[PDB]
């Protein structure tokens, strides 16, 4: 019924790579963001424009289009912050102690503690990035993990999705086997990668709590889209 299952592993990899959203830039203002108004304004603005690309990316994920529109909405509402964050820690790998929100916007933890609550979110994001760098996370593995998040995070709230999730698992194992990893190294690395997703979920929920608090304090205006994403959560 679904094309996603007839896809070979390399075809699955090629599909995910080609569907990759661009790395967006922040405002070219050379000002170091320290105020919570200036920083969170840049993060929400960056998230706004990225969400449009994520939606476009989500459609091109094999299996996602086969779902009903309501199921597609639900999955994106649940996983959007996870997907942004795993994208953040991915491109921040080559910059230890720093978070590459944008190529012209690198934030360290010293800026995070000028905002109440953020410095722990930052530290958790930094640890995930360092963890990825130490596992020598490959781009082909990253696009599989991101699609897993999209499909998994909202599953409960139906056999098809489970079948696609199995396909991505086969795809991940396929990549590690291509990299010369032994069978033991294959199921250990797979376990390690998937255990990171629990922490990504944790950071997302924590991030969603801070997002809600910003809506209440009302100083950083939120776009209608970010508000509807946030309402869906709570």
């Amino acid at each position: 019924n679904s094309l996603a299952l007839s896809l070979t592993a390399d075809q699955m990899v090629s599909a995910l790579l080609d569907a990759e959203p661009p790395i967006l830039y922040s405002e070219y203002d050379p000002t170091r963001p320290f105020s919570e108004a200036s920083m969170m304004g840049l993060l929400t603005n960056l998230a706004d424009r990225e969400l449009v690309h994520m939606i476009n990316w989500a459609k091109r994920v094999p299996g996602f289009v086969d779902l009903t529109l309501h199921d597609q909405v639900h999955l994106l509402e649940c996983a959007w912050l996870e997907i942004l964050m795993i994208g953040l820690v991915w491109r921040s790998m080559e910059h230890p102690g720093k978070l590459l929100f944008a190529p012209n916007l690198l934030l360290d933890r010293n800026q995070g503690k000028c905002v109440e609550g953020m410095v722990e979110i930052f530290d958790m994001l930094l640890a995930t990035s360092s963890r990825f760098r130490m596992m020598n996370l490959q781009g082909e593995e990253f696009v599989c993990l991101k699609s897993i998040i999209l499909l998994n995070s909202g599953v409960y709230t139906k056999d098809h999705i489970h079948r696609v999730l199995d396909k991505i698992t086969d795809t991940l194992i396929h990549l590690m086997a291509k990299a010369g990893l032994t069978l033991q190294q294959q199921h250990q690395r797979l376990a390690q990668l998937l255990l990171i997703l629990s922490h990504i979920r944790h950071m997302s929920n924590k991030g969603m709590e801070h997002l809600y608090s910003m809506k209440c304090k009302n100083v950083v205006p939120l776009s209608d889209l970010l508000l509807e994403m946030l309402d869906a959560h709570r």
């Binding site: 939606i55 989500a58 459609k59 597609q72 909405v73």
Partner: peptide, 10 residues
């Protein structure tokens, strides 16, 4: 309703 309903359509 939702903006997400519209953006997912094309």
């Amino acid at each position: 309703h939702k903006i997400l309903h519209r953006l997912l359509q094309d």
